[PDB]
Amino acid sequence: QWPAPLANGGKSWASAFKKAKATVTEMTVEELANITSGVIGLCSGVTGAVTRLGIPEFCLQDGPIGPRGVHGSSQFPAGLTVAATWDRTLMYARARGMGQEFHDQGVHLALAPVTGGPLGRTPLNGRGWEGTFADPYACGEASYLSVKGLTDAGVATVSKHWIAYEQETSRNLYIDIDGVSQADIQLPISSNVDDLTMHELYMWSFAEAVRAGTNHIMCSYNRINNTHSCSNAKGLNQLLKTELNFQGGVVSDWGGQWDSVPAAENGLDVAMPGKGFLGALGDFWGATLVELINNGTVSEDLVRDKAVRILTGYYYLGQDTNPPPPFVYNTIGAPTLNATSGYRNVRKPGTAELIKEIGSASVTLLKNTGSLPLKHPQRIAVLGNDATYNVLGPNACGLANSACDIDNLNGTLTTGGGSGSALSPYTITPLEALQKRAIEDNAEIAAVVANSNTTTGAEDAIAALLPDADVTFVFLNRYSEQGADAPDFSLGGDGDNLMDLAVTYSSNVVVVIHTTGVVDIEKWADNPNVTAILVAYLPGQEAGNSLVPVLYGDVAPSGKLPWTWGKSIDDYVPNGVVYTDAYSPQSNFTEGVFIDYRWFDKMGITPRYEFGFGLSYTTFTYSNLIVDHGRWAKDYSSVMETAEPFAEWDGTNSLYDVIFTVFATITNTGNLTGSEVAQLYISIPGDNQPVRQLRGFDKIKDLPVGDSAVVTFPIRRKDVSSWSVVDQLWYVPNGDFLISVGGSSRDLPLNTTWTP
Amino acid sequence: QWPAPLANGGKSWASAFKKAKATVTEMTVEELANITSGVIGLCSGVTGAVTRLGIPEFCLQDGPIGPRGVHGSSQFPAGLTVAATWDRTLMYARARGMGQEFHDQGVHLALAPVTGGPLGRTPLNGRGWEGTFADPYACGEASYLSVKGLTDAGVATVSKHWIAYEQETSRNLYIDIDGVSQADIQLPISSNVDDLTMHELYMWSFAEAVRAGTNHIMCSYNRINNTHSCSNAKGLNQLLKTELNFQGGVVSDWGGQWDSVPAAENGLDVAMPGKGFLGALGDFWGATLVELINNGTVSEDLVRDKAVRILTGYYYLGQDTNPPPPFVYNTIGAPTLNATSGYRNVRKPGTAELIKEIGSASVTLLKNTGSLPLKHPQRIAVLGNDATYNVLGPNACGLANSACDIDNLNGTLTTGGGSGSALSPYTITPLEALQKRAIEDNAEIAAVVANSNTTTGAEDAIAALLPDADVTFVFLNRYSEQGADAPDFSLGGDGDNLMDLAVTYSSNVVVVIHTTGVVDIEKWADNPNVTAILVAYLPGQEAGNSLVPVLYGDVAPSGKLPWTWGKSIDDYVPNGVVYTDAYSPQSNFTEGVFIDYRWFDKMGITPRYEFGFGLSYTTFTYSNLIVDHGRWAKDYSSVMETAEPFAEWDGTNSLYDVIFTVFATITNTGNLTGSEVAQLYISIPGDNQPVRQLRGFDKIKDLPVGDSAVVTFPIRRKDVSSWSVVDQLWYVPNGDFLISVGGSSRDLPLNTTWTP
Ligand SMILES: *[C@@H]1O[C@H](CO)[C@@H](O[C@@H]2O[C@H](CO)[C@@H](O[C@@H]3O[C@H](CO[C@H]4O[C@H](CO)[C@@H](O)[C@H](O[C@H]5O[C@H](CO)[C@@H](O)[C@H](O)[C@@H]5O)[C@@H]4O)[C@@H](O)[C@H](O[C@H]4O[C@H](CO)[C@@H](O)[C@H](O)[C@@H]4O[C@H]4O[C@H](CO)[C@@H](O)[C@H](O)[C@@H]4O)[C@@H]3O)[C@H](O)[C@H]2NC(C)=O)[C@H](O)[C@H]1NC(C)=O
Ligand SMILES: *[C@@H]1O[C@H](CO)[C@@H](O[C@@H]2O[C@H](CO)[C@@H](O[C@@H]3O[C@H](CO[C@H]4O[C@H](CO)[C@@H](O)[C@H](O[C@H]5O[C@H](CO)[C@@H](O)[C@H](O)[C@@H]5O)[C@@H]4O)[C@@H](O)[C@H](O[C@H]4O[C@H](CO)[C@@H](O)[C@H](O)[C@@H]4O[C@H]4O[C@H](CO)[C@@H](O)[C@H](O)[C@@H]4O)[C@@H]3O)[C@H](O)[C@H]2NC(C)=O)[C@H](O)[C@H]1NC(C)=O
Ligand SMILES: CC(=O)O[C@@]12CO[C@@H]1C[C@H](O)[C@@]1(C)C(=O)[C@H](O)C3=C(C)[C@@H](OC(=O)[C@H](O)[C@@H](NC(=O)c4ccccc4)c4ccccc4)C[C@@](O)([C@@H](OC(=O)c4ccccc4)[C@H]21)C3(C)C
Ligand SMILES: CC(=O)O[C@@]12CO[C@@H]1C[C@H](O)[C@@]1(C)C(=O)[C@H](O)C3=C(C)[C@@H](OC(=O)[C@H](O)[C@@H](NC(=O)c4ccccc4)c4ccccc4)C[C@@](O)([C@@H](OC(=O)c4ccccc4)[C@H]21)C3(C)C
Ligand SMILES: *[C@@H]1O[C@H](CO)[C@@H](O[C@@H]2O[C@H](CO)[C@@H](O[C@@H]3O[C@H](CO[C@H]4O[C@H](CO)[C@@H](O)[C@H](O)[C@@H]4O)[C@@H](O)[C@H](O)[C@@H]3O)[C@H](O)[C@H]2NC(C)=O)[C@H](O)[C@H]1NC(C)=O
Ligand SMILES: *[C@@H]1O[C@H](CO)[C@@H](O[C@@H]2O[C@H](CO)[C@@H](O[C@@H]3O[C@H](CO[C@H]4O[C@H](CO)[C@@H](O)[C@H](O)[C@@H]4O)[C@@H](O)[C@H](O)[C@@H]3O)[C@H](O)[C@H]2NC(C)=O)[C@H](O)[C@H]1NC(C)=O
Ligand SMILES: *[C@@H]1O[C@H](CO)[C@@H](O[C@@H]2O[C@H](CO)[C@@H](O[C@H]3O[C@H](CO)[C@@H](O)[C@H](O)[C@@H]3O)[C@H](O)[C@H]2NC(C)=O)[C@H](O)[C@H]1NC(C)=O
Ligand SMILES: *[C@@H]1O[C@H](CO)[C@@H](O[C@@H]2O[C@H](CO)[C@@H](O[C@H]3O[C@H](CO)[C@@H](O)[C@H](O)[C@@H]3O)[C@H](O)[C@H]2NC(C)=O)[C@H](O)[C@H]1NC(C)=O
Ligand SMILES: *[C@@H]1O[C@H](CO)[C@@H](O)[C@H](O)[C@H]1NC(C)=O
Ligand SMILES: *[C@@H]1O[C@H](CO)[C@@H](O)[C@H](O)[C@H]1NC(C)=O
Ligand SMILES: *[C@@H]1O[C@H](CO)[C@@H](O)[C@H](O)[C@H]1NC(C)=O
Ligand SMILES: O[C@@H]1[C@@H](O)[C@H](O)OC[C@H]1O
Ligand SMILES: O[C@@H]1[C@@H](O)[C@H](O)OC[C@H]1O
């Protein structure tokens, strides 16, 4: 085994550690078992109180778009959607806003963000949308800022899911309900991950989360090399708590804990949900952990270290001197918990405008043949239930946005299904917003929003409506959800039918896709009747009013794709989702570090739309690439430090030191003002190395016609490193490094060589 | 027989008559038959050209809300809806706006307004909504202003339908299509109307239409005393063309003409639609009328008088010196007419705001227990497909708003079905408008707009949503249409179910009814969970934005009911709709003059909501009734004059002279500013006379709290007259007249006696 290292508070939590140790020193064995296992309450999870010492219950609450199952709050855009902005300021402000609302609702610990698990090995991942980029570097940057935004608002974070949690299928949470136990059916999928892949690929974003000060981390459902993540000594005690120097608590996912003793010894700190959800998801600690200590199987001091880890967050964020107000909403639901809900409104001035701005900044133009931007069209047709409201109400699908019937017309896809969803005070529909703009132009506008296959008359309505239209907007979607992967890339609902009808009857079709990921558009993407295609991802509540200004040219589109859009699912990493009824299911990560565009680049597969692709209404020319070797600096700014070994280590040094900076220049060479995401890729020399790896991005805002601006990329030591499996450390390999800059992963007009 | 009197141009058309006679004098027999029978074209009806003399084809076009089947136009509110405003200025401006759009689309003759047929003998009349009030006096005033507004814009009018056209059922238009002829199935319903009833009840509004200068009149489908209206000598040659002194043309309804010779001799002028609609609706004139003249059966001079009547309008409105532009839309439809459509936009600045104002002025508050006006509710539920768009598009139901399937979710009922409908450039939905106001108050709002009986989950969505709501808006409707009467008072669609669910789960339910007439609300109107009830009638395109300001108190509601709302259909005139398969179906108008509230008042039946009932957010006190006998004046202002005989006639005199004026005073005695419709009723002494008869209305706008204003009622000679069947003239009977003033037909705090 790898022994459990003791918390010491590290960099920023030293004083809070000290108060945590003082309190925990006073605790009895019953009290230690109480704080470390869940109890019944209104939140996703609730830690027992330590009543005698005045430590209250902590509310742990979903989710990564804001607190789930609460009224009086805003529905923020999904992580996928903010990734697609490529705007650091928006990644932070989104998180800070979510945090404000978490705090004002009474949440102590936010079950957020998703910071690298699932990272994106398969594009069918039913919950991939909760994360950000299918790229370690960019996911790392988003994860850093998301964590910082949440904690800066006074909410502790529980970053998730550690680690190699890359498929929902056979995730097999522990559950024992009505005589049928998952242990007797099938064990969780095992992620079989080589050491290099674990370091260079899956750990990257978690390192950034630890550096940003995440207070906790949640261990996933999957197994790793046939050992449960939540009792994987190598995972938690070694890689997380030793190499990453993590100082906070490891919280089990809900049914992630499979056992009592291995869990306490191998790095687990908090058993969730404990007595919540009827005890059906395992209840391995609590009174049972009291007996394990008193009879000497589990070390008392070991358990005190778990308590210390939990309380460090409490004191660091000042939840003692500034308590959160009470959490008033039943987010569990009857009959599981019968208990009434109060009411509180926490929506602040500015939040609706921020959510709108994220939408306008993310929406991504994949195809424009000249129909966009719109001028002042006079006869406008609109097709698709995605254009309008859920017919049962925007929250009809319930507490996790997953309970409406398989055929329901859910309206605009504003968030995905599951624990990462949230309620919505309203939906600004695409149709409401297009209609407002139509009225200003004295135009007419009509929408067919029924099911084009199963409602009588819809097809003929469509036939009758489209030919005369100046433009036809088609709104498509693809719902996906926690607990299943998507079967394939197929549009949800009547999507395919809408598109076949649309091109039969209109030669100016503009397609807008609200989705949790990549969809199959192969039948029509090259039809010249589809004059424009845009993906708007998951925009939360301001869906229509964020889209329409971009469509009409008020602001040029500036979003780019945060993953690869291949022409077929066969173009990706093989065995993305393993289906088997084998009792011990296996997923071998044979691809290694080569996921998403790294796979495409290495096998020479040409995607339909590459990673980092997006059109504007203008063009940008790249020039004057400069590598400034003299432009280096100490890492002073992190909240916490890791202990990742590296070759050049000398006591005063860091893996996150900036060792040089790359500069380049962009010129708007088109006819309209626009923003541009500049991207930097490095080819690190070695055996079996990716052709190139994203190591920088910078977004210039609203570059006027003919103007220029400089983009700037700080390069850290780690960014040019490789991990030595033989030596067990990060090193900068000798050799020629290629540095590329440009507008996508495949449009890189500038390059240069750098040698250390 | 009653011989056909010759046109002479009467009062305002004298010079146009002269030019008409000159032109017609030059016409051959072929040319006379061409102008007097319909030909194929893009409009509802088209008169043949007289090519040699440069007289083009005239476009006749539906309908009484504006030109039908046209893009580029606005959907105005229905006549029912403007009646409910009780605002003369709005009745005029609505008509003038409709006229502008008629003209700018190229229409020569508008098939509008509905000016007393159907007037409202039965509240089940499928097309009652096209007219205004179920009251001769008020229908007369609306009819005068509607006609004036249309002609003032340069469009000739064809006022309809003459006369005693009081049920759609067995209207039996002539049609002979695919070997099956209506003549071999069933004759039109016969209206058996006594002479007093015809004069005091059905003729009243047509007299006002003739006085306002209607250029034509359309004869109805029904028979009168077992003679078709369109060949009823007594109807057309005598009552219309002699007593009413009508100087314009009688146009057949479409399939209203049953014969060639009786029609030419008994007063018909224009055979419509002629060769249009495949000749299937009879084609009795045209080439056949050429042979009838040349072989001497039909007098040539008689036919010249028809031509003269048609051309008088053309010259009077200046359609020669200012031609209408071309009519560019196929309003017939393929396969009946295959022909392409151009495009023109005629929507002017100001029209959308006028249609909104009519909505805000008409919406009628029937019940308010204190829930209205709304303050700033934070959780708002909305129920009903009426709250949102037609799922197939607002115009999906086609050229006459009547072709969507029996179950379709048609969305907000903005106009009724049939030839009196029109297309809509958009629908401002109740839900869009409530949502905008919710957003301003930082509130949440959710709508269940599916079918609550047949869509899975809707009922539970409803159960789950309503209890927590501060207010629940329920939107109900009742579509009806030309060519059928309503079976009963039942809400359309899932109405009944919505209301049962609403009161189970909310104690603050506010009901809004969009309808073509009275509906059965008896199950819930007295439930204290229904805290407010409003009828909004048919608001055209600005449905939501006209309603919401009234709901939120920006303006107090000031509409009142234009018909009686009885508790059951058994409370009305019996035999309202006769159903039979008898070849010659009969309707005996045994009730005489006693329709609508005259029936209720006479039989001592207490309606649920009386004629002229509506609540405000304030109250008004009535005081200081004055009859000013000295306040009389000559009738100088009419466009045309009738020749109605009357006892006091002396050459310089008129039946429309004002013989006194009634004044009264209203004081706003509540807490909020509001508008008030003041109503005047006279009890004319006689045998079998109504208890009281509306003879005045005046609307005070925005009366501040504690302020007073005077309402003024001019009383004409005709207004205190009766018709002598023995003498065949109007007379003022000797005796005591009761004069009542107040806020409804049953809330009349002021009264006084007047003797001639
Ligand atoms: C899930 O399972 C996979 C299953 O394999 C696990 O992965 C393994 O992870 C361990 C670390 O826990 C690796 O152990 C290290 O192995 C080094 C030798 O590697 C070479 O030999 C092995 C065995 O014959 C091969 O498998 C390797 O091949 C792979 O890597 C190469 C190189 O890139 C590729 O080309 C191959 O194709 C494979 O991908 C190698 O050829 C070994 O040197 C290393 O030794 C040090 O580290 C430990 C500390 O843990 C010390 O105890 C030991 O004393 C050595 O440390 C001293 O020495 C160095 C100097 O040499 C100093 O710098 C130190 O500070 C110190 O004083 C270590 O044992 C194993 O190789 C790796 N396998 C693969 C295939 O990746 C996952 O960890 C497992 N995960 C979980 C979560 O359970
Ligand atoms: C659909 O059918 C109904 C079926 O009846 C038709 O109605 C009738 O309409 C005609 C007019 O075209 C009426 O004719 C007039 O009758 C007068 C006599 O009426 C009394 O007797 C008759 C017959 O016995 C009764 O039916 C009447 O009863 C009804 O009215 C009374 C009174 O209120 C009620 O109490 C009853 O219960 C009934 O409702 C009466 O008791 C008759 O005097 C009148 O005579 C003059 O008019 C014509 C001009 O058309 C002259 O030719 C004639 O010379 C008289 O005119 C001179 O005399 C007067 C002075 O007396 C002068 O002032 C004149 O200027 C002139 O020099 C006339 O014949 C008939 O009564 C009426 N029936 C009913 C039941 O209403 C509908 O018209 C028909 N409609 C259509 C469209 O086809
Ligand atoms: C299994 C699971 O994930 O359950 C939890 C409760 O904590 C878990 C975390 C999860 O995020 C949470 C909160 C969610 O938010 C999910 O979005 C969520 C799910 C993914 C879903 O999960 C499932 O459908 C399970 O696969 C499903 N499992 C089974 O039917 C099953 C039974 C025996 C052996 C193996 C499987 C299940 C359905 C309904 C109740 C319990 C279990 C249950 C669950 O009801 C929700 O489940 C419960 O609320 C619940 C669980 C146990 C008892 C009572 C209630 C779900 C929702 C909200 C729909
Ligand atoms: C019967 C009738 O009212 O037809 C007209 C055409 O001029 C009439 C006036 C009417 O206002 C007009 C324009 C309308 O606008 C109506 O809203 C309207 C109707 C009320 C409707 O009328 C009916 O449904 C008839 O009762 C119906 N009648 C019969 O089926 C019938 C056949 C034989 C004997 C007795 C009855 C019918 C349906 C479809 C085509 C022709 C007749 C036809 C009609 O298609 C529309 O009809 C046609 O367009 C049409 C008529 C004949 C031949 C070809 C087309 C209708 C619409 C638009 C739906
Ligand atoms: C509107 O949103 C709805 C949710 O709020 C969407 O419904 C969900 O959609 C997904 C598919 O996209 C379904 O997931 C699959 O469903 C089945 C499992 O169903 C049952 O099968 C057996 C029963 O014998 C049993 O094993 C299961 O427990 C289920 O009872 C499988 O095909 C897949 O494995 C996968 O889980 C959801 O089931 C469905 N939810 C519900 C509650 O029906 C809906 O698709 C949205 N509308 C549109 C157009 O996208
Ligand atoms: C949405 O608006 C729709 C129209 O655009 C509404 O559909 C119409 O609604 C009325 C009833 O409210 C129906 O009128 C009745 O229908 C039938 C006649 O149907 C057939 O019966 C025989 C066939 O064997 C034949 O004689 C007829 O020609 C018909 O084929 C009778 O019950 C009545 O006499 C009456 O005419 C319309 O038929 C219906 N239109 C269509 C095209 O189906 C719809 O109701 C609206 N939705 C809601 C919720 O109100
Ligand atoms: C272990 O955890 C238990 C569950 O959290 C804990 O119990 C709970 O104690 C809290 C206070 O710490 C109580 O909360 C409220 O109760 C009283 C009235 O009874 C109020 O005056 C207070 O304001 C307070 O809000 C809970 O009632 C109680 N919950 C349950 C389910 O019993 C135990 O105390 C913990 N045990 C140890 C050893 O600390
Ligand atoms: C009786 O009515 C007929 C139908 O309206 C009428 O015919 C039509 O005549 C018009 C002009 O009055 C023609 O309109 C266009 O034709 C020529 C080109 O062919 C253009 O140069 C002109 O600009 C004009 O717009 C119609 O083509 C014609 N319609 C049909 C169906 O024949 C007869 O002329 C009328 N008969 C009499 C005796 O007047
Ligand atoms: C310690 O406690 C656990 C849980 O009750 C029990 O299974 C185990 O056998 C105990 N050890 C001894 C030595 O009794
Ligand atoms: C494009 O639309 C036109 C109608 O606008 C249609 O006739 C043509 O077949 C369509 N083209 C394709 C490739 O579907
Ligand atoms: C009114 O609503 C309440 C719930 O708000 C319900 O319990 C009660 O039965 C309802 N009353 C009626 C008369 O339906
Ligand atoms: O937040 C948790 C989610 O990430 C996990 O997968 O399911 C349990 C949830 O409550
Ligand atoms: O306008 C006409 C309408 O009033 C009549 O009833 O049907 C024929 C229509 O075209």
mmCIF file of N, CA, C and O in Angstrom, chain A residues 534-552:
data_model
loop_
_atom_site.group_PDB
_atom_site.id
_atom_site.type_symbol
_atom_site.label_atom_id
_atom_site.label_comp_id
_atom_site.label_asym_id
_atom_site.label_seq_id
_atom_site.Cartn_x
_atom_site.Cartn_y
_atom_site.Cartn_z
ATOM 1 N N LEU A 534 -24.997 26.750 -37.277
ATOM 2 C CA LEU A 534 -24.404 27.266 -36.026
ATOM 3 C C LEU A 534 -24.681 26.259 -34.904
ATOM 4 O O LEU A 534 -25.776 25.676 -34.820
ATOM 5 N N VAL A 535 -23.737 26.094 -34.009
ATOM 6 C CA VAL A 535 -24.000 25.287 -32.808
ATOM 7 C C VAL A 535 -23.993 26.246 -31.630
ATOM 8 O O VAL A 535 -23.123 27.066 -31.539
ATOM 9 N N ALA A 536 -25.069 26.236 -30.848
ATOM 10 C CA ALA A 536 -25.267 27.133 -29.684
ATOM 11 C C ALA A 536 -25.171 26.399 -28.380
ATOM 12 O O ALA A 536 -25.243 27.031 -27.370
ATOM 13 N N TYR A 537 -25.011 25.078 -28.398
ATOM 14 C CA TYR A 537 -24.618 24.297 -27.203
ATOM 15 C C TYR A 537 -25.727 24.342 -26.169
ATOM 16 O O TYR A 537 -26.844 23.985 -26.503
ATOM 17 N N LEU A 538 -25.479 24.827 -24.962
ATOM 18 C CA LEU A 538 -26.519 24.815 -23.901
ATOM 19 C C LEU A 538 -26.500 26.179 -23.213
ATOM 20 O O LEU A 538 -25.663 26.392 -22.314
ATOM 21 N N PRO A 539 -27.379 27.089 -23.641
ATOM 22 C CA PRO A 539 -27.248 28.518 -23.271
ATOM 23 C C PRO A 539 -27.918 28.947 -22.029
ATOM 24 O O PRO A 539 -27.809 30.165 -21.668
ATOM 25 N N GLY A 540 -28.549 27.982 -21.336
ATOM 26 C CA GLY A 540 -29.251 28.329 -20.127
ATOM 27 C C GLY A 540 -30.475 29.203 -20.526
ATOM 28 O O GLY A 540 -30.993 29.037 -21.607
ATOM 29 N N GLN A 541 -30.835 30.180 -19.717
ATOM 30 C CA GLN A 541 -32.155 30.739 -19.749
ATOM 31 C C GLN A 541 -32.295 31.775 -20.836
ATOM 32 O O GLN A 541 -33.393 31.999 -21.292
ATOM 33 N N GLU A 542 -31.191 32.411 -21.229
ATOM 34 C CA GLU A 542 -31.219 33.499 -22.227
ATOM 35 C C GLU A 542 -30.939 32.976 -23.649
ATOM 36 O O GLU A 542 -30.180 33.559 -24.405
ATOM 37 N N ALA A 543 -31.599 31.912 -24.042
ATOM 38 C CA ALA A 543 -31.240 31.208 -25.268
ATOM 39 C C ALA A 543 -31.488 32.029 -26.506
ATOM 40 O O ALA A 543 -30.611 32.178 -27.311
ATOM 41 N N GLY A 544 -32.661 32.633 -26.597
ATOM 42 C CA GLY A 544 -33.072 33.367 -27.789
ATOM 43 C C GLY A 544 -32.393 34.697 -27.933
ATOM 44 O O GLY A 544 -31.959 35.052 -29.007
ATOM 45 N N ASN A 545 -32.334 35.449 -26.846
ATOM 46 C CA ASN A 545 -31.787 36.802 -26.902
ATOM 47 C C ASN A 545 -30.274 36.830 -27.000
ATOM 48 O O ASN A 545 -29.716 37.816 -27.426
ATOM 49 N N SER A 546 -29.597 35.761 -26.579
ATOM 50 C CA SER A 546 -28.177 35.604 -26.898
ATOM 51 C C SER A 546 -27.872 35.266 -28.391
ATOM 52 O O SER A 546 -26.871 35.731 -28.957
ATOM 53 N N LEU A 547 -28.744 34.485 -29.012
ATOM 54 C CA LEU A 547 -28.574 34.037 -30.415
ATOM 55 C C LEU A 547 -28.887 35.106 -31.454
ATOM 56 O O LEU A 547 -28.151 35.303 -32.433
ATOM 57 N N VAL A 548 -30.010 35.781 -31.263
ATOM 58 C CA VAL A 548 -30.536 36.604 -32.333
ATOM 59 C C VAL A 548 -29.642 37.782 -32.758
ATOM 60 O O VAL A 548 -29.561 38.062 -33.941
ATOM 61 N N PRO A 549 -28.976 38.456 -31.807
ATOM 62 C CA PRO A 549 -28.074 39.540 -32.172
ATOM 63 C C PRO A 549 -26.932 39.104 -33.095
ATOM 64 O O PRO A 549 -26.454 39.918 -33.909
ATOM 65 N N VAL A 550 -26.511 37.850 -32.931
ATOM 66 C CA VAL A 550 -25.435 37.244 -33.733
ATOM 67 C C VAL A 550 -26.009 36.925 -35.102
ATOM 68 O O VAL A 550 -25.479 37.353 -36.130
ATOM 69 N N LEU A 551 -27.141 36.284 -35.127
ATOM 70 C CA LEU A 551 -27.816 36.094 -36.420
ATOM 71 C C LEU A 551 -28.016 37.409 -37.267
ATOM 72 O O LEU A 551 -27.803 37.412 -38.483
ATOM 73 N N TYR A 552 -28.382 38.506 -36.611
ATOM 74 C CA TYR A 552 -28.687 39.783 -37.295
ATOM 75 C C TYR A 552 -27.484 40.708 -37.442
ATOM 76 O O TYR A 552 -27.606 41.802 -37.978
#
